[model samples]
Target: DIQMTQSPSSLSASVGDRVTITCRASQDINNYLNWYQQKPGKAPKLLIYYTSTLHSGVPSRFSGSGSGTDYTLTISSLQPEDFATYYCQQGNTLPPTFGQGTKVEIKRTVAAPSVFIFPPSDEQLKSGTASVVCLLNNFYPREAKVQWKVDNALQSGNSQESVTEQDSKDSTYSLSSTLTLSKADYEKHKVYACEVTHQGLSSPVTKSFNRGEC
Candidate 1:
């Protein structure tokens, strides 16, 4: 599946502000489109579907419209409690896909810090080749660690990854790691996890990827 992802400059918003975003499909996907919003520590909620219809129970201020291979999500009057990250997903293919995400904020800003994950940088699409890459960025304290686990077994490796730091009004650090596995290795392994641990943080944040089904 081809996924489109986005991150907004802020995650806090006041009432009546406009929230807009665009999502594009790698290939023509008809109109099988969906939108979701997620707050910190909570599961994501569906907001839009089939291009423009609002999902049941969604706030009236949230509306979506577009056609063909392109779509847009808009929040006409942003509410304070509505501050969160938004994402678009396509449900018209074998492997479901999702957009990055846009985080709404109270004040306007150039950009905000965020963390992301990806598949391996290099992989041979041979019969059974698969890999995963974890992309983490815009974090602070510089005391974070990323780990990879396969089939519930912890793998050992050096921190040979790279880290880049940037300073604006907010400070951020970014890093990436790649995990490679042949088709046989991936078939024998049912699950993979990209875990992040940081100081002063209660629990580590873990993003899990499953080969077949969720």
Candidate 2:
């Protein structure tokens, strides 16, 4: 399989900026290169084919080039409509291969989170242990920390944080922290709290789960 190695997996660009993406084939693919642009919720639109030929109705600003194992896609002065993903494909082989794709987006701004707590499930509460999850939704910067507190005191060693997930449509982030404790230990404490500290917020946000809920 001739792999098409793509670069700049993602990029931040603005209107009027020039953006270039590269895709290198493992071996010669002649000029059987195709470039496609994809916007959210729509099918990919062919922009360039056969290395340098612009597809019908595609603006001249969208261009493709290179030969053999090297190929390039360039957005000559990016436009508002160009903020999407681009892919390059090799059509010279039996099973055509495509680059993973390069995402072109605008710079993101800080977004505050909407915090909530999910109490321990009834099934889990009856099984000798309790679990609670703290969710932080629609946040930005992706740099945040979460800590657990028991009965108003900071606690540690019982919480696990999940990786932040980015929303494809808006590019905001969401994260969750799960806290686990023995049923006996949960009953021993009056309250359990999740403390989230994020750059988008002025102060750390804390959401609590009461022992009475269990």
Candidate 3:
């Protein structure tokens, strides 16, 4: 899924205050991107969709790289009319996305999968099951694929993959994939591995583990 976010979460700015927000694509979006804003109880207003082009009326201080990924949105000289939350998304087609405080809003994209095995909680550990998670953080133009391996062999079994969640002010997202194993396999496997792949990455970051004293 595609995702995005604004930096510093939020802030208070004077009339001439300056801040920059970034928007990115998970991969090559062919520059099919857009920007918009909304009021508390009003319809969302179109700001920008055609890359670099502003929508209708825009301030001289408020500027962005416009459309595209690995780019930033710099809105300087804060205006009183600018109090709405800002976010960005990239794609070829448009979706019905609701603005702030709404779960229906479209969501970045950014770098590598921070893969790991969530040490089974006391309950899960005793329940004869294990879970392996792969997280992609500090990544851009969101894109990544995750695979699991047991004893160096591909896992062709059932697994749980969560939707990619954005966790930044920039156009970056965090994605997670989980692999569940039986107590028999978790405690018995000689090796467990998770492989992550991204578009900008030269190679997959494969992390493996082996049970031992260390």
Candidate 4:
């Protein structure tokens, strides 16, 4: 029986996100690759076959591309109902084999984000505004979730501004989010928290800063 291996055992995605899952066979499987989608408590449904052909009734957004020992299943735009586990199989040889399932999930992106919360600088104080900066260092797949909390409570209209930068050395990404407030608005005893979420992280990363510490 031929063996099949799949990449990204679990993928983090959101509605309207575009995603692709890859499957590679140990040996050439010709153009007989087949792809299936399955949700919890439901039987697997064929989505694509013969490397790039859509199975009957499969939506136009679901597509297959590739040949030889390599094949890929792509969702042009993820829909709410499209979240499920996907698998690939080879039909060109005897004793068919299916690749391990790739679970498509709803969430943020990759690379364990290194997080830090910086105290307001003297320049900010002189400008009559206290700008606290939160930095996400060296993460991959740029998309991330960042939120600011004041004394442990989530804040809205927090005067938050954000930007992304790519690091040439590591080919990763960095994001900086700034929370601005009046110099007099900062409470010395209060705490500011920066919460970060990414798929490469096992759990959310939180970094705190106390104005009094400055």
Candidate achieving higher TM-score, 1 or 4: 4
* Top lDDT hit: 2
Error of 4 at 5 (Å): 0.6
Q: Order of all candidates by TM-score, from best down to worst?
A: 2, 4, 1, 3
Candidate 3 segments exceeding 4 Å error: 1-114, 117-119, 212-214
Better of 1 and 4 by lDDT: 4
> What TM-score does structure 3 among the candidates reach?
0.47
Q: Any runs in candidate 1 off by more than 4 Å, and if so which?
A: 7-14, 108-214
Q: List the global CA lDDT of all models.
A: 0.68, 0.84, 0.57, 0.80
Candidate 1, which ten residues in sequence have the lowest lDDT sum?
Answer: 106-115
* Candidate 2: clashing pairs of residues: none
lDDT of 2 by residue, 1-214 (tens): 6898889888876557788999999989999999988886689998999999988999988888899999998888866567678989999997999999998875467888888998888889899998889998888767888888888898788888785545565667788888888888887788888888888789999988677357
Residues forming the 10-long window of minimal summed lDDT in candidate 3? 98-107
Estimate candidate 1's alpha-carbon lDDT, on a 0 to 1 scale: 0.68
Models 1 onward score TM values of 0.47, 0.73, 0.47, 0.51
Go through the candidates in order and give the clash count of each.
16, 0, 13, 1
Evaluated with TM-score, which candidate comes out highest?
2
> Which is the winner by TM-score between candidate 3 and candidate 4?
4
lDDT of 4 by residue, 1-214 (tens): 7899999888866667899899999888888999988876679999998998988899999988887788888898877567678999999788989998998765434567889889888876877777788998888767779998888988777756565533333435788888877777664448988899987888899999766444
